[PDB]
Amino acid sequence: YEHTAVMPNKVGIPYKALVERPGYAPVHLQIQLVNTRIIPSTNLEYITCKYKTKVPSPVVKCCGATQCTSKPHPDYQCQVFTGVYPFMWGGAYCFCDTENTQMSEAYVERSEECSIDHAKAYKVHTGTVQAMVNITYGSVSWRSADVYVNGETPAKIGDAKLIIGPLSSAWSPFDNKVVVYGHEVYNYDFPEYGTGKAGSFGDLQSRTSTSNDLYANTNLKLQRPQAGIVHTPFTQAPSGFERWKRDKGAPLNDVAPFGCSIALEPLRAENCAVGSIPISIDIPDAAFTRISETPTVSDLECKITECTYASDFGGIATVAYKSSKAGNCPIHSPSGVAVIKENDVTLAESGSFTFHFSTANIHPAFKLQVCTSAVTCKGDCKPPKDHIVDYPAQHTESFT
Amino acid sequence: YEHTAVMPNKVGIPYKALVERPGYAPVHLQIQLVNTRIIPSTNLEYITC
């Protein structure tokens, strides 16, 4: 009875399949893939952020030169300068007039915002998708368990053992190269660590926040201070993190395909509705009811009464139930034409009980399996009027 | 279900149409045009006496 089932990847709607175990009473499913969070394999390549030209205070030798050296600070720009007369609080102070030397030095450093407000590149591989699958199973009526997709993983949470996927729809909405910012995720071809052109994205490129080493192509060019005054002309491109916040591109949670949402959290891409998942469950046999205890319902009749050719469960149909015992009777349309809101219907001794459903074909000729009794609920449906609210329960469009 | 209906202009009698909304139970109308007062556009030109 290990109920294999191909199953559409779509998040917010149950998939009430039916266990046709030969010998005992069938049992309905209710498989709602409440989430499709993905979490691909990734690598933190480098944080970037806007620089801060945290200038070390220049040297001023008063009569003669002060040769600079290339200190190992990131992008340590330093250039000796002569021909000053530095006004500092008493007019000038160095008594020479051309031998007055000024050595300006400036290096690039991570902002304090780099720790917290920072873009973040990644080389993104495929990884392994997940889900908090609820099944309000059978008469168990509950399990809300986190699972995987790889087609040999069980998750014995509740009582049922369930194996999912691998899904066929391998579209990772993440590209190979991704930039990430706070919550807005950008599938951007970041240039690389160690290379980013100044002004362009990644002018600062630190491996992480702690990493004292980095790559700072900022085109930081010191110029001589003017007219014998102490200061430090640092001529520099404002960061490619400054832009990339107001001349950027749009976020993947606003431009992705096939229906995904995003988080700066394990780097999941939630709820990506695409393709199918070959899902298979091993039910606990204890949860089964033996066949000789559920009422046999045959010699019945089914008919629509007001079929709504729609998404919400507007389709209805009375069923002239013709039972033997009285009790519950799980139901399902093995044809995917009709999706039913009721998993189970209570029965007195051969009464009648309408259920709700939804279809996509004008003439819904769908079988209905009322606990081992098939029936065609043939009829005709009506279009609605009022179509602006969230996503459907029908999801069965085909040739009609 | 915005129930369009051509409807005879006649005052003192209801017009009990029926709402055939696909999906829910229909509902009857009872439209009685109790009055057809007109009030055209006019102009006081002159009193006489």
Residue of chain A nearest B26, judged by CA positions: A306
* Contact call for B21 and A314, based on CB within 8 A: no
Cβ contacts below 8 Å, chain A against chain B, sum to 18
A84, A136 in Cβ contact below 8 A? no
Closest CA to A98 of A112, A82, A113, A87: A82
Q: Any chain A CB within 8 A of the CB of B45?
A: no
Cα A54 → chain centroid? 38
Q: What is the resolution of this structure in A?
A: 7.3
* Contact call for A308 and B1, based on CB within 8 A: no
Q: Which of B2, B23, B25 sits opposite A308 (nearest CB)?
A: B23
SS3 A253: helix
Q: Any chain A CB within 8 A of the CB of B23?
A: yes
Residue of chain B nearest A382, judged by CA positions: B22
Q: How far apart are CA A192 and CA A115, in angstroms?
A: 20
A331, A26 in Cβ contact below 8 A? no
- Residue A328 phi/psi, 5-degree rounding, is -85, 160
Residue of chain B nearest A304, judged by CA positions: B23
Structure tokens at A386: 């009022």
Show which of residues 289-348 on chain A sit within 8 Å of chain B, judged by CB atoms.
306, 308-310, 314
Q: How far apart are CA A23 and CA A2, in angstroms?
A: 14
Query: Cα separations (Å) of A314 from A331, A355, B26?
Result: 17, 10, 14
* Contact call for A310 and B21, based on CB within 8 A: no
Beta bridge mates, A163 = A280
Experimental method: cryo-EM
Q: How far apart are CA A39 and CA B34, in angstroms?
A: 68
Query: Cα separations (Å) of A123 from A41, A155, A200, A216, A304?
Result: 9, 30, 19, 20, 55
Pairing outcome for strands A381-382 and A301-308: parallel
The DSSP letter of residue A24 is: B
Closest CA to A272 of A4, A84, A12: A12
Q: How far apart are CA A50 and CA A239, in angstroms?
A: 5
Q: Is A272 exposed, middle or buried (0-12, 13-18, 19+ CB in 10 A)?
A: buried
